Enzyme design. Structure first.
Site, PDB file in Angstrom:
ATOM      1  N   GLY A   1       1.304  -1.154   0.201  1.00  0.00           N
ATOM      2  CA  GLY A   1       0.019  -0.143   0.355  1.00  0.00           C
ATOM      3  C   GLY A   1       1.075   1.131   0.020  1.00  0.00           C
TER       4      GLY A   1
ATOM      5  N   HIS B   1       4.236  -6.491 -11.426  1.00  0.00           N
ATOM      6  CA  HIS B   1       4.346  -5.713  -9.650  1.00  0.00           C
ATOM      7  C   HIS B   1       3.931  -7.060  -8.532  1.00  0.00           C
ATOM      8  CE1 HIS B   1       4.981  -3.329  -5.966  1.00  0.00           C
ATOM      9  NE2 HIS B   1       4.128  -3.061  -6.208  1.00  0.00           N
TER      10      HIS B   1
ATOM     11  N   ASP C   1       7.743  -4.802 -14.171  1.00  0.00           N
ATOM     12  CA  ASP C   1       7.173  -4.077 -12.628  1.00  0.00           C
ATOM     13  C   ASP C   1       6.696  -2.849 -13.082  1.00  0.00           C
ATOM     14  OD1 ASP C   1       6.590  -2.840 -10.576  1.00  0.00           O
ATOM     15  OD2 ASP C   1       7.473  -4.547  -9.011  1.00  0.00           O
TER      16      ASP C   1
ATOM     17  N   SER D   1       6.649  -3.850  -2.269  1.00  0.00           N
ATOM     18  CA  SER D   1       6.021  -2.691  -2.722  1.00  0.00           C
ATOM     19  C   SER D   1       6.027  -2.033  -1.054  1.00  0.00           C
ATOM     20  CB  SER D   1       4.710  -3.228  -2.493  1.00  0.00           C
ATOM     21  OG  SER D   1       4.058  -1.935  -3.144  1.00  0.00           O
ATOM     22  N   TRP D   2       5.476  -1.371  -0.546  1.00  0.00           N
ATOM     23  CA  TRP D   2       5.755  -0.414   0.667  1.00  0.00           C
ATOM     24  C   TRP D   2       6.164  -1.327   1.752  1.00  0.00           C
ATOM     25  CZ3 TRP D   2       6.430   4.281   3.091  1.00  0.00           C
ATOM     26  CH2 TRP D   2       5.991   3.685   5.344  1.00  0.00           C
TER      27      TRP D   2
END
Lengths: 313, 313
Positions: B43, B294, B266, B110-111
Site C-alpha cells: 500500500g 509487480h 514491474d 511493495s510498500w
C-alpha cells in the site's frame, strides 16, 4: 515623469453583502459624477490601499475601490469558502449594478490584471477601457517560475528563506507543500508558512528591495489572508477551464482599448506574459518599463499608468 | 516452480492498543514454536489478506501478520492522524515485544519493502533475514513515475481513467491534486478520487490484467483507506529526512542476509530501485522475474519467494 495625484479620502465608504457569508468593503473617491473606474487589487487577497486612489484625476474620475472576498477589510477575513475567480467576477457585477453604473474602466495590476481580463472576457459590454499592469495569466509555468524555480535564480539569498519553510522531501512541489500548511488546523503552523510565502513576494516586487514593503508583508494579519488566498487560487489553477483560457478568449476583448504597462525586470510575473497578451490583443499599447520591477509604484510604472489614465479621462 | 502453501487459518487472532487512538489487528499462523516472521503488507494502507499466510512453511514458521494503522481491520479505519513511517516502525517493535520474540524474519513487498527497510535500518539487531519483493524506495522519481508520468506510457488506456478524476488545470502535480480531494470534507468527492486512485494500481499490478484485482480495488471500503493512506505517505515523502534515506542508511543492513525478488515488467515500482538497493546492499540475492509484474502473486514471484522462505527455514 508623472506622479500619483495627491492623497485623497473616500467621499463614501460602505459594505455589500454579496452572499449569505461574504460582506465586501467598498469606497468611492474623486468626482461623484466623473468617468467611472473600478480598482482591482492584486494578490489575490491583498486588498486595496490608500495609494491606489491616486492613479486617477479626481476631477475627471469617479474612482470605485473594494476588497475582494476574505481580503483586507472584507469578511470573513482570509475565508477560502466560495472564494473563486467566477465569484469575484460576479461580485464586480453586483457592485456595478448596485452603484448604478452601466459601463466602466477596469484598472488592475498583478492578480488585478488576471481579474480584469477574466471579468472583461465575461462581460465585454460593461468595460470601457482596460488599464493593466504586471500581467499575470496564471498559466502553470508562470506559477512555477515564481514559486518553484525561476526568480529563485536572481534572488538566491531571499529564496533560502522561502525554501526553509518546507522540509527537503516535500520541496518537489512547493506550492502544494505550502497549501497543506496554510490549510493546517494548527494556527502556529499556518502562520509560519503564510509569513514565509508572503515575504517572498515582498522581497521581489521592486527593482530595488524595499525594506518597509518586506516588513509590511510579514505582518501576521496581512500574511494570513494574502498567503492563503494566493496559494488557494494557484493550487486550483485560477479555477479556469483550461490553463491558457485568458489567451484563448482574448478575442472577446478585441475592440476594447487599453494599455499594458509592465516592467522589464519584473521577476514576479515575467514580461513574457505581457508579450503574449499583447500578441493576442493588438489594440492595446504595450509600454515596457526599461528599469522597473513588478510593483505599480515604481517611478516608470507610475508615470506610464498616470499617463494612461489621463489619456482616457 | 513452487506454489503458495495451502490455505491456512490463524491459531490466534487479536488486537493490540498501540496508542490511545490506534488498535492494530494481528494474527498468528503456523508452528507456534517455529521460526518467527512478521508480514508487512503493501500500500501503504492495504492490510493483509488470507493469501499472505501461505509464503511460509507452516511446519517451520511462526507466521505473524498484522494490519498497519488505519488499514483493513485496524482502527480507526482510514486514519491519517499519527499515521507515519516511524509510528509504523514503532508498532513493529510493540508487536515484537508484546509477542515476546527477540529477533524475526521481516517479509514485505511493495510498500512492505519500504517499511521492512526503514525498520531493519532502525533496528538491525531484531532482524534475522529480509525477504523483499517489488522494491519501493520512495524517492520522488518513483512517485512521479507511477502517479505523474512514466507507467502512463505503457498503460494509456487505463491512465485515461486516473487522469479524468482531476480537472485539466490541476493535472500538473497529480498527487497533490488527489490529496486535496482525498482530504475533502465532502464524502462523495473523496470517494470518487479514492476509487480512481485505487483502480490505477489495480489495472497495472500484473503483467496480465487481472479483472478481479481491479474490481476488488474499486470497493468503496478498501478504496478509501488505500487511497488516503497511500496518497498521505507520498505527498509527505514517506516522512523521511532525505529522499534517498533508504539508500543512505543501507550500510546498517550490510550483514543481514536477504533476497530481493523483482519483476522485470514491474510498472508500479520499476526494476530501477531493486537495482540500486542491490548495489547498496550486495549481500542480498537479486532475483529478477523474466516475465513478471509487480504483484507477489505472479507465478515467477511466488516461486522465488517460496524458495527464499524455505531456504531460510
Amino acid at each position: 515623469m508623472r506622479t500619483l495625484y495627491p492623497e485623497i479620502t473616500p467621499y463614501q465608504q460602505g459594505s455589500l453583502k454579496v452572499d449569505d457569508r461574504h460582506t465586501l468593503y467598498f469606497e468611492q473617491c474623486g468626482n461623484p459624477h466623473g468617468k467611472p473606474v473600478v480598482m482591482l487589487h492584486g494578490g489575490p487577497g491583498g486588498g486595496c490601499n490608500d495609494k491606489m486612489r491616486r492613479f486617477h484625476d479626481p476631477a475627471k474620475y469617479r474612482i470605485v475601490l473594494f476588497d475582494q472576498r476574505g481580503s483586507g477589510r472584507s469578511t470573513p477575513h482570509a475565508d477560502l469558502v466560495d472564494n473563486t475567480t467566477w465569484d469575484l467576477v460576479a461580485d464586480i457585477e453586483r457592485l456595478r449594478t448596485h452603484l448604478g453604473v452601466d459601463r466602466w474602466q477596469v484598472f488592475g495590476g498583478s492578480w488585478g490584471s488576471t481579474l480584469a481580463l477574466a471579468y472583461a472576457q465575461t462581460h465585454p459590454q460593461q468595460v470601457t477601457e482596460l488599464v493593466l499592469r504586471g500581467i499575470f495569466l496564471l498559466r502553470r509555468f508562470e506559477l512555477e517560475w515564481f514559486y518553484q524555480e525561476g526568480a529563485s535564480r536572481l534572488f538566491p539569498d531571499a529564496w533560502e528563506h522561502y525554501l526553509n519553510a518546507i522540509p527537503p522531501v516535500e520541496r518537489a512541489d512547493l506550492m502544494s507543500a505550502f497549501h497543506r500548511r496554510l490549510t493546517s488546523d494548527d494556527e502556529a503552523t499556518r502562520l509560519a508558512a503564510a509569513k514565509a510565502w508572503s515575504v517572498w513576494e515582498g522581497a521581489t516586487s521592486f527593482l530595488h528591495v524595499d525594506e518597509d514593503f518586506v516588513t509590511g508583508h510579514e505582518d501576521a494579519h496581512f500574511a494570513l489572508a494574502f498567503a492563503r488566498i494566493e496559494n488557494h487560487y494557484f493550487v486550483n489553477g485560477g479555477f479556469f477551464e483550461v490553463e491558457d483560457q485568458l489567451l484563448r478568449d482574448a478575442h472577446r476583448i478585441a475592440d476594447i482599448p487599453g494599455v499594458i504597462v509592465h516592467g522589464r525586470y519584473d521577476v514576479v510575473c515575467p514580461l513574457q506574459s505581457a508579450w503574449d497578451l499583447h500578441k493576442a490583443w493588438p489594440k492595446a499599447q504595450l509600454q515596457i518599463s526599461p528599469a522597473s520591477g513588478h510593483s505599480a509604484f515604481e517611478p516608470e510604472n507610475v508615470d506610464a499608468l498616470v499617463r494612461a489614465t489621463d489619456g482616457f479621462a
